[PDB]
Design a protein around this nucleic acid. Structure first.
Ligand SMILES: [Mg+2]
Ligand SMILES: [Mg+2]
Ligand SMILES: [Mg+2]
Ligand SMILES: [Mg+2]
Ligand SMILES: [Mg+2]
Ligand SMILES: [Mg+2]
Ligand SMILES: [Mg+2]
Ligand SMILES: [Mg+2]
Ligand SMILES: [Mg+2]
Ligand SMILES: [Mg+2]
Ligand SMILES: [Mg+2]
Ligand SMILES: [Mg+2]
Ligand SMILES: [Mg+2]
Ligand SMILES: [Mg+2]
Ligand SMILES: [Mg+2]
Ligand SMILES: [Mg+2]
Ligand SMILES: [Mg+2]
Ligand SMILES: [Mg+2]
Ligand SMILES: [Mg+2]
Ligand SMILES: [Mg+2]
Ligand SMILES: [Mg+2]
Ligand SMILES: [Mg+2]
Ligand SMILES: [Mg+2]
Ligand SMILES: [Mg+2]
Ligand SMILES: [Mg+2]
Ligand SMILES: [Mg+2]
Ligand SMILES: [Mg+2]
Ligand SMILES: [Mg+2]
Ligand SMILES: [Mg+2]
Ligand SMILES: [Mg+2]
Ligand SMILES: [Mg+2]
Ligand SMILES: [Mg+2]
Ligand SMILES: [Mg+2]
Ligand SMILES: [Mg+2]
Ligand SMILES: [Mg+2]
Ligand SMILES: [Mg+2]
Ligand SMILES: [Mg+2]
Ligand SMILES: [Mg+2]
Ligand SMILES: [Mg+2]
Ligand SMILES: [Mg+2]
Ligand SMILES: [Mg+2]
Ligand SMILES: [Mg+2]
Ligand SMILES: [Mg+2]
Ligand SMILES: [Mg+2]
Ligand SMILES: [Mg+2]
Ligand SMILES: [Mg+2]
Ligand SMILES: [Mg+2]
Ligand SMILES: [Mg+2]
Ligand SMILES: [Mg+2]
Ligand SMILES: [Mg+2]
Ligand SMILES: [Mg+2]
Ligand SMILES: [Mg+2]
Ligand SMILES: [Mg+2]
Ligand SMILES: [Mg+2]
Ligand SMILES: [Mg+2]
Ligand SMILES: [Mg+2]
Ligand SMILES: [Mg+2]
Ligand SMILES: [Mg+2]
Ligand SMILES: [Mg+2]
Ligand SMILES: [Mg+2]
Ligand SMILES: [Mg+2]
Ligand SMILES: [Mg+2]
Ligand SMILES: [Mg+2]
Ligand SMILES: [Mg+2]
Ligand SMILES: [Mg+2]
Ligand SMILES: [Mg+2]
Ligand SMILES: [Mg+2]
Ligand SMILES: [Mg+2]
Ligand SMILES: [Mg+2]
Ligand SMILES: [Mg+2]
Ligand SMILES: [Mg+2]
Ligand SMILES: [Mg+2]
Lengths: 127, 205, 260
RNA sequence: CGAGUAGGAGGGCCGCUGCGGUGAGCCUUGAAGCCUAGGGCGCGGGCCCGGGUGGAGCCGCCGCAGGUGCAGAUCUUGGUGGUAGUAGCAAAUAUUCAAACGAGAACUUUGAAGGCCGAAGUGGAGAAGGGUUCCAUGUGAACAGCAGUUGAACAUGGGUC
RNA sequence: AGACUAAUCGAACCAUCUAGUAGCUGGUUCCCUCCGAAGUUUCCCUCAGGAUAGCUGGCGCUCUCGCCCACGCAGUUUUAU
RNA sequence: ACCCGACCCGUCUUGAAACACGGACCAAGGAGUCUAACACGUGCGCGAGUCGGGGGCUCGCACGAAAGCCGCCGUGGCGCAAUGAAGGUGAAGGCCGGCGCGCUCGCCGGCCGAGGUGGGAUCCCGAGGCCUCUCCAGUCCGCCGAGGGGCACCACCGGCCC
RNA sequence: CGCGACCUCAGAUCAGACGUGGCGACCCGCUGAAUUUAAGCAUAUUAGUCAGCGGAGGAAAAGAAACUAACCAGGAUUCCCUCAGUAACGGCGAGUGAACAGGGAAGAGCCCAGCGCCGAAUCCCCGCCCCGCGGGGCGCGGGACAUGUGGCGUACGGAAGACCCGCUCCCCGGCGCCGCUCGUGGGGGGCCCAAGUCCUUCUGAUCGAGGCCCAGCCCGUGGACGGUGUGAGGCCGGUAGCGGCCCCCGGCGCGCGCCCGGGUCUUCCCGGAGUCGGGUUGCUUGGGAAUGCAGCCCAAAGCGGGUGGUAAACUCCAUCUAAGGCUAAAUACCGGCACGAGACCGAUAGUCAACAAGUACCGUAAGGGAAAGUUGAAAAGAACUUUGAAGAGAGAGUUCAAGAGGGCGUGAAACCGUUAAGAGGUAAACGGGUGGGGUCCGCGCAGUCCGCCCGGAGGAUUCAACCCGGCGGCGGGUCCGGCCGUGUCGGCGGCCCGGCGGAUCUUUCCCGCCCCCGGGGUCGGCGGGGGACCGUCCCCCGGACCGGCGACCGGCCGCCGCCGGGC
RNA sequence: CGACUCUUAGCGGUGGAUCACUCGGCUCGUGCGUCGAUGAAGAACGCAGCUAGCUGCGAGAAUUAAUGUGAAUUGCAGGACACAUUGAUCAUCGACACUUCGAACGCACUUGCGGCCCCGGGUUCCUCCCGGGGCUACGCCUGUCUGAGCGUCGCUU
């Protein structure tokens, strides 16, 4: 129950902040949970997502153990594109179907300097 | 327009009132402004009481209300001078000062001197440098509460008289009267002419 | 509305044209020019008596009647027939008013809530509120009122010392101080007898704070409990008593219908 | 015992919309609406039931609150008809034959004849105002009150020393 | 010529005051059950309107008849005058 | 299909099928509201009282712009008292005796203390008889002539204040 | 002639500063109508309002009495409740309409001229140095301001000066940090609980059901939103005097700048002018024999002046100190910068504007000012085959669906198209009455009753009684076995180891005081405590009723369900 | 017979009602409460790889530097794809710039016309030489400088 006096429990204000977010706020809404064996090593519940995370889809018409690689992350449509997720058009050309990463389990990450530094700050604060 | 039996109603609504109407929906908000204004005043000060200037004791000027008594505004300069303390000394003590107020009545005048003797007995002050002039020892942890409520002394405490019992005597139920109002009320209206009618009686000669 | 029900400016044509006498806006070219201006019955007209902010919203109620209502609504919450008639589940519950200890008001975690209400047999009422947290009917879903949820029990207490943190986000519960009572909480909607848990110092403050008929209420101003209309009110036990049914006429049970 | 305009009261498990209460109500296994030679109920306001459509929320009962119930106002705004394939496309003399491109020619282009404006011009150039209308190429759904293979249309690209 | 003054003239146009005023025209949205009239008096710058009575409705209240004579009342007769 | 009935609705109007007016046709929108004030009526709370309505106290807890409290916050409002232009004055009689010419006449002492008459729901006292031999006896139900203290209220008399 | 001084003056692209303009909701100063109402209309009312004009701020304005009062007297302003629809006004008509009290919010009070004292002890600028950074200031020399009078002490509450008495050492801003700050100082950034568990619907699932007597896991986190639909646990955030990171500001302490205050007595000092008032004339107000403002004229005084509400004298008294100045608060805000909430509106509603809205477009212009939200879960927005040149179609495909195909959700009614049925001379339509046909619907088509009881036929079960086993329950009197109920009372029990109150009392009881001749004195009066009294309600033995919704055993017949016996 | 007219009903079409949804309004309340001669509000034009409107910026023009965030922007191409090099994008905003008109400020407002001072070039000072930059409104405040007066005086030929 809301006990801040300075936060929105309005339907119209939250949808307005959703579809008119800035881009650096838009990174955190498209966050994806980690696999539960990998969360045991890191002590973090979910991660912001990027260009080269190997991904198990969980929900959709494309379900279960299809661990491919992602390629684009449209922030604009709140939609990622994975390698394996295909569907043909009419004119014989394949295209990629997008999945919102509330419906995505990250099994492999991309490891770099700033990805570690978040992960320390995430794991320490869960405490 | 008017009809079967009803009262003549003259409201003042010809003047276009809807432009000039103050609406009190800001009434809970100001009330929470003002507790949080007094409480912001509470934790600024220090040991000194909120509503801290002490008020005098004043009877209410009419024939209607002069049987009750009221915290006035400031102690008389001449009242406050009988207690012996200088003017701008006294406001730093925390006493209210009013130059406009006379003292016709020594029963009023001495009653406030008793009140100042009360307050200066009451006062626990703190110095800047403990040279010990008019200052306090380690005194009851700032005397058990920092702040008072609605004046330091409960200023109303309107004093009542008992005059509990007495035997009725001879010559009071024999002499007192309604008529000694009417004789005296008519005595007052005729003091001017009875002076003059006898004065021109002996001026005639 | 307040203004700008009609920002527009118009006068009426009148006679020599076949239209009507509503004001018509002045100009041309823009195809609202010529249309119907302000009034009720037009597009973009004002409404009929545009509602005013200085309506009489707030209602004042006598201070004895409010206290009469608290006195009545507490009295309904001591009968199991009335409180099941509101809709609560008391079928396996402990005897009515039910005083839990003053040890309750220092709970910290909320497993201690759930272990309490399952041991007091009040958990059946909460499990109804889980089944009743459906969505609103109407248009209120737009204006921030989206969840319909029926009430449960309420713990009436004094000396808040952690119970409001532990019982807080139980679904459908109202956690309520003794010396600040509401009629809007004790009898929601106007239908009396909400199932209520009293605490030891709660249920012992009520003797002090309202008083008997014999003593006063030693925590309020001048409020004795209000005197009664009937004293002994069993209608059947009065009417079968020896005093009445000696004194009566006779019964009369033949029908004697329309004789042809 | 029953009539009823103007009118006043009463009852409504009549309807609409919103709010606390309740229905361990209702539903992607199909809610609202809408339609219905389908089955009924009520004196009536109006409702319940089936079928068909659609695809995500809705209704009962007790209370509370209305900007709450249409045939009318030369009603406002929106929409469609009968009139109707009707009036009408009639100011200033006018077209014709052939040929080319083109799905497609009474009008576009060329060529010949027959013509009119007739130098106060239906000609040659400007001031005002119009502002890309000028030129070229390209298409033929609009628009040009018939048509168009044309244009002062649309589309692209040029030009005003 | 009372003409013309941006298709506006015996006082332009535009916006506000302004939702000006009107005893005067037009409209006034669901059913059922009960009761159901007036156009007359008097006065009013009253005569196309109101005021007042009359007429109408509603809400009550105070009582009586349920058992050789009741109480009360009347658009009626009778008997007197 | 047919027999019989059958003029087109609103409106003003002495009267409308009217040679009176508005109404081509459908959908949606659309017209006694709200604030103040007074009056009667009604429900509820209290009662010679009533009222927090303006303030303050609660911790600052989503719903809390709520609610709860004060009372040496009852100042005040309205009511308890009227009348007069105003100075102003401002609502108890009845019973048994006494004093003067006991008179067109006022005073002195006790004893209850809001008068009286006609009407007047209800209540009380009820003579009187009523129920299988008879006496002999108290409860008892119901009827009850007449009588009694009489509510609300109306009609009338007396009194009291200005 | 010539110079020098000062005053009136002008000149400058002089050195350096300043004003202009904007928004205008709230505030301030002037100006100012009319419709309306009076049933007409002039005064009145509308209203000192809309419009016009000027100024400013986060508030403004107002303000420390030329006041109210009329008695036990108050004591700056502003604001709220009351005074009050009241005194007053007014063709005394319609109407208009204060204030002092009283209770609240808030409370903060001061300076200058004059009077003289101090030798102009004061000030600005420049020059040169001082100082620490973020930038602005304190110590030295010259040039002005300035006697037509800067500064210090001074303000009507009195003040000053000289005695003498009493005691007295203060206050001030920077600076560097140790420390705290009422939800726990302000700002922004990044972060923190728990299922995708089995089975299953569906285009998709966030549904529907379930997880060991400990109720599957987290809850200080069940507010809300997103994600192929309805989510405490899938994601962001929500919860908390939760956690850390940066930036800023307000609460203790090394150096500057400054410092005689209090009482009594003696002496002298002590004030605002074409202003107050008076005349008149306009306007305004409730203000009336003139409330205030303003013009014109007349024009002041000192024991004076203004006021004290009916003009005018003769007074007595009350009360204030005008014609100089400043000052936070509570109060106001339909503009602006952020923000949460709504018994609101849901596209003909709501702002005119949910949209490329003050825009398209009209008027030369002042100005006027519209319409227009909706594909799907996702574009998977229909490749290819095939008539026509193409528009337009038939096949095909994608989709759960093209009965969603680019204003693409549902798609009503008017009106129109075709198919089916029925009818056709008194325009159509309608009410009553049956009829014919059609339509589905219901029955199962003459083949429809349901269950009860008994006397008959055929297989199986186990009673009832009647007792014993054992549970539970209802029903009664003694008050029985206790409590408690309800009351007349006794102890006055808690009285000071009691709760509440009491205009009951008590100088035989204190204290702060007043009195009578340093004290006692009871001669009276003021106030806080104390403790007898009541009047209710918190105790203890006893009786007086009652076992009444106040609950338990005892025992009683009679119900009762389970065991075991018995047709 | 058909044709036609009418009544229904199925199906198609016209039209956009109803219903549902809402990045929107109004209303209340809170905390702040700030504009411009250092050149405002407003107006004009300009600026994107493909760009007309809306928005955004101002010849540095769809913003640069820094701070924060740490990897995309997106209709299509292209590029640094790096990020123990200095880091893609957005957000914040404390550095730098801000063309033309506007109180608008050289004079006018016709892009017209000037006047000084300084540097670059070029007849190597100029003469109305071309480019580049500064200054040049009014009112007024104190200070300074120049000088007018038979204003009033002195000293004086
Ligand atoms: Mg909102
Ligand atoms: Mg009337
Ligand atoms: Mg008006
Ligand atoms: Mg307007
Ligand atoms: Mg509108
Ligand atoms: Mg609905
Ligand atoms: Mg009838
Ligand atoms: Mg319903
Ligand atoms: Mg319904
Ligand atoms: Mg509404
Ligand atoms: Mg309406
Ligand atoms: Mg009608
Ligand atoms: Mg019409
Ligand atoms: Mg037509
Ligand atoms: Mg023709
Ligand atoms: Mg013809
Ligand atoms: Mg050819
Ligand atoms: Mg061809
Ligand atoms: Mg010719
Ligand atoms: Mg020509
Ligand atoms: Mg051309
Ligand atoms: Mg071509
Ligand atoms: Mg054509
Ligand atoms: Mg073109
Ligand atoms: Mg003429
Ligand atoms: Mg003209
Ligand atoms: Mg005229
Ligand atoms: Mg009107
Ligand atoms: Mg208006
Ligand atoms: Mg009008
Ligand atoms: Mg009748
Ligand atoms: Mg008449
Ligand atoms: Mg008429
Ligand atoms: Mg009647
Ligand atoms: Mg008619
Ligand atoms: Mg006619
Ligand atoms: Mg007609
Ligand atoms: Mg017509
Ligand atoms: Mg409608
Ligand atoms: Mg009443
Ligand atoms: Mg009072
Ligand atoms: Mg009139
Ligand atoms: Mg006026
Ligand atoms: Mg104005
Ligand atoms: Mg200005
Ligand atoms: Mg400002
Ligand atoms: Mg202020
Ligand atoms: Mg001032
Ligand atoms: Mg009054
Ligand atoms: Mg007035
Ligand atoms: Mg959701
Ligand atoms: Mg959720
Ligand atoms: Mg989470
Ligand atoms: Mg006036
Ligand atoms: Mg004087
Ligand atoms: Mg004088
Ligand atoms: Mg006098
Ligand atoms: Mg003074
Ligand atoms: Mg002054
Ligand atoms: Mg719509
Ligand atoms: Mg509109
Ligand atoms: Mg979609
Ligand atoms: Mg083709
Ligand atoms: Mg479908
Ligand atoms: Mg659709
Ligand atoms: Mg659809
Ligand atoms: Mg959908
Ligand atoms: Mg046929
Ligand atoms: Mg259709
Ligand atoms: Mg549409
Ligand atoms: Mg940058
Ligand atoms: Mg230059």
């Amino acid at each position: 129950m809301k006990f801040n006096p300075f936060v929105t429990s309005d339907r119209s204000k939250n949808r307005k902040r959703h579809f008119n977010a800035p881009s650096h706020i838009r990174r955190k809404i498209m966050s994806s949970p980690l696999s539960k064996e990998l969360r045991q090593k890191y002590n973090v519940r979910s991660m912001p997502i990027r260009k080269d995370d190997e991904v198990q889809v969980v929900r959709g018409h494309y379900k279960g153990q299809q661990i491919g690689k992602v390629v684009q992350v449209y922030r604009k449509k709140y939609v990622i594109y994975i390698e394996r997720v295909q569907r043909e058009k009419a004119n014989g050309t394949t295209v990629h179907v997008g999945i919102h990463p509330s419906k995505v389990v990250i099994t492999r990450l991309k490891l770099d300097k700033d990805r570690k530094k978040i992960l320390e700050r995430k794991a320490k604060s869960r405490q | 327009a008017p009809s079967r039996n009803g009262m003549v109603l003259k409201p003042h609504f010809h003047k276009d009132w809807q432009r000039r109407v103050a609406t009190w929906f800001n009434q809970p908000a100001r009330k929470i402004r003002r507790r949080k204004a007094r409480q912001a005043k509470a934790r600024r000060i220090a040991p000194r009481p909120a509503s801290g200037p002490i008020r005098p004791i004043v009877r209410c000027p009419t024939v209607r209300y002069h049987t009750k008594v009221r915290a006035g505004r400031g102690f008389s300069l001449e009242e406050l001078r009988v207690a012996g303390i200088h003017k701008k000394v006294a406001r730093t003590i925390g006493i209210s000062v009013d130059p406009r107020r006379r003292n016709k009545s020594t029963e009023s005048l001495q009653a406030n001197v008793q009140r100042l003797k009360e307050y200066r007995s009451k006062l626990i002050l703190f110095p800047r440098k403990p040279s010990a002039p008019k200052k306090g020892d380690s005194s009851a942890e700032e005397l058990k509460l920092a702040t008072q409520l609605t004046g330091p002394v409960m200023p109303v405490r309107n004093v009542y008289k008992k005059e509990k019992a007495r035997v009725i005597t001879e010559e009071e139920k024999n002499f007192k009267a309604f008529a000694s109002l009417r004789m005296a009320r008519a005595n007052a209206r005729l003091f001017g002419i009875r002076a003059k009618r006898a004065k021109e009686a002996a001026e005639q000669d | 509305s307040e203004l700008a029900g009609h920002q527009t400016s118009a006068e009426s044509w009148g006679t020599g044209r076949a239209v009507a006498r509503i004001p018509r806006v002045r100009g041309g070219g823009t195809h609202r020019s010529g249309q119907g201006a302000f009034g009720n019955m037009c597009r973009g007209g004002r409404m009929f008596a545009p509602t005013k902010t200085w309506r009489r919203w707030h209602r004042r109620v006598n201070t004895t009647q409010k206290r009469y209502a608290i006195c009545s609504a507490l009295a309904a919450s001591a009968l199991p027939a009335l409180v099941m008639s509101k809709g609560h589940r008391i079928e396996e519950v402990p005897e009515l008013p039910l005083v839990v200890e003053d040890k309750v008001e220092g709970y910290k975690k909320t497993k201690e809530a759930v272990l309490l209400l399952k041991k007091l047999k009040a958990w059946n009422d909460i499990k109804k509120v889980y089944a009743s947290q459906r969505m609103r009917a109407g248009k209120g879903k737009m204006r921030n009122r989206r969840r319909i949820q029926r009430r449960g029990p309420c713990i009436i207490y004094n000396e808040d010392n952690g119970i409001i943190k532990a019982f807080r986000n139980i679904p459908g519960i109202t956690l309520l101080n003794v010396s600040k009572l509401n009629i809007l909480k004790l009898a929601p909607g106007g239908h009396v007898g909400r199932f209520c848990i009293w605490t030891e110092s709660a249920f012992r403050k009520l003797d002090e704070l309202y008083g008997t008929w014999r003593k006063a209420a030693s925590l309020k101003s001048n409020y004795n409990l209000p005197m009664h209309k009937m004293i002994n009110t069993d209608l059947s036990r009065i009417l079968k008593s020896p005093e009445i049914q000696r004194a009566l006429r006779a019964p009369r049970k033949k029908i004697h219908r329309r004789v042809l």
